[PDB]
Nucleic acid binder design. Structure first.
Lengths: 167, 259
RNA sequence: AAAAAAAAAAAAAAAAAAAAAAAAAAAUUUUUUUUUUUUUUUU
RNA sequence: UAUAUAAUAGAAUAAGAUAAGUUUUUUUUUUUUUUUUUUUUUUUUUUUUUU
């Protein structure tokens, strides 16, 4: 809806902190996205959520993995166990995602600093698969800049050639 | 972002094989027609004139009438002056299935059906059913009760104008005759006696076969209404078919519909 | 001292233009029924 | 002088969340307040003419 209600938010955040263990994949993918959007950050709650999602890394669907990774990346809260656990899972699901979701996941991975071909190879194939929608998203025209800065031209000659091209 | 030729090719491929499709493949078909409907909806302003009718038929045969494709039918109501009477008759039923069928569109539609040198049974049936539906369209007990009868008289006027040329057409089967006669009777349209004679002679000649061959079909109800229609209109239309139907009912050669 | 004419100031009435502020409602009657097969292509 | 047959019935009755496929004027009327212009009326001041 787009409404800010702080006082209620603090109580809900504390209660969620008290009940961290009961979260599912859907609950984490919702709570983390909402907290990232609204600006209210809790260090201990986020550490507990990342540690819990480390064990539940297999239960994420197409939406949850990408959304959780992007929300963690924008919050600058980058645990390493969560980083590896979520990055390894990307190869299984990469066929299902959409263009914008793949772009967001790639930006989160670039901020994750993994640079491992085993993880990165299917993501670039899928990005080439939906390159028309990939390069026609204004909400993220600046989001590809950091990805291509981190990886560099020596990584994907076709994607780099298309990027340099007018479009 | 599907190309213009791609949608046409896929639709034509999925349309022309519909007549004998296997059952367990139907549902998947519809999904293919729904995952890419929005592109057709936005491209609605670029399709060629017969391609519109083709796409509408391809969507209709798969029992699918999504709202996103409603503008296409609207275009058909605007460019109706280019189609042949056969295509116009098909467009009448297509429009009726799209809820687009109103009074003015049918009023403009009937002329193209009229312009044919020789009528065919599809055009006659489409005209009759469209006229009946648009007669049901006008409301007496409504907020516009001032011009109900002045509109019904006009509708009957065209009805007569298409009825006077009904002797030129061959009637493939009895149900077509029943539909035309039902519209005529329930709408109170006068018809010339020559067209009545041709209709009833054709019905007699066609109904001879099933009775004489003792098997293949005509339901007993159908014979009831045919006998009743002639009795209302007179025996002189077919002074032989009267006793012919009476004998056919006496022998019980026409089984019930639920039998 | 009185009358007429011209100019300036103030008050009231009418008309036109610009700006700002306030208000605009509703009452269940919408539609159904073909045997339709005419896209075009080197995938 | 043979190696082979197979058939009976009854009932009427309803549960309930999957992160989805629009957007193409903005304007008219009434009332109040302020500002500007024009017309009419009244008051004051100045100048000219006549008695």
């Amino acid at each position: 809806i787009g409404i800010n209600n702080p006082e209620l938010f603090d109580n809900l955040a504390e209660r969620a902190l008290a009940v961290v263990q009961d979260h599912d994949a859907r609950d984490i993918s919702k709570t983390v996205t909402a907290l990232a959007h609204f600006g209210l950050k809790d260090e201990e709650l986020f550490k507990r959520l990342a540690s819990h999602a480390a064990s539940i890394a297999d239960q994420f669907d197409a939406m949850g993995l990408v959304n959780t990774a992007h929300a963690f990346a924008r919050t600058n809260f980058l645990q390493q166990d969560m980083a590896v656990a979520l990055s390894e899972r990307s190869v299984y699901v990469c066929r299902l995602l959409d263009a914008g979701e793949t772009r967001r996941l790639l930006w989160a991975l670039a901020k994750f600093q993994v640079r491992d071909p085993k993880i990165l190879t299917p993501v670039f194939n899928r990005c080439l698969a939906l390159h028309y929608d990939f390069f026609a998203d204004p909400t993220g025209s600046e989001e590809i800049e950091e990805i291509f800065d981190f990886y560099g031209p020596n990584f994907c000659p076709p994607l780099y050639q298309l990027y340099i091209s007018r479009g | 972002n599907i190309d213009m030729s791609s949608v046409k090719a896929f639709s034509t491929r999925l349309f022309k094989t519909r007549r004998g499709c296997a059952k367990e493949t139907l549902d998947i078909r519809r999904k293919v027609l729904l995952a890419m409907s929005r592109r057709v909806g936005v491209l609605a302003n670029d399709f060629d004139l017969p391609s519109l009718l083709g796409v509408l038929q391809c969507y209709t045969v798969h029992d699918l009438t999504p709202f996103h494709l409603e503008p296409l039918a609207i275009r058909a109501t605007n460019h109706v002056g280019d189609f042949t009477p056969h295509e116009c008759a098909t467009l009448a039923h297509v429009l009726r299935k799209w809820r687009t069928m109103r009074l003015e569109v049918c009023e403009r539609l009937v002329e193209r059906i009229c312009t044919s040198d020789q009528l065919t049974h599809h055009m006659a049936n489409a005209a009759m059913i469209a006229i009946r539906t648009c007669f049901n369209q006008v409301s007496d007990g409504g907020r516009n009760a001032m011009n109900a009868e002045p509109t019904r008289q006009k509708l009957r006027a065209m009805g007569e104008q298409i009825g006077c040329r009904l002797d030129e057409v061959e009637y493939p089967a009895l149900p077509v005759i029943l539909s035309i006669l039902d519209v005529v009777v329930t709408l109170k349209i006068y018809v010339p006696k020559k067209c009545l004679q041709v209709i009833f002679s054709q019905a007699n000649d066609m109904v001879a076969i099933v009775m004489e061959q003792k098997d293949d079909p005509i339901t007993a109800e159908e014979g009831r209404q045919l006998q009743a229609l002639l009795s209302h209109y007179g025996n002189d239309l077919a002074p032989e078919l009267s006793q012919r139907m009476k004998e056919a009912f006496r022998e019980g050669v026409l089984p019930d519909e639920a039998s």
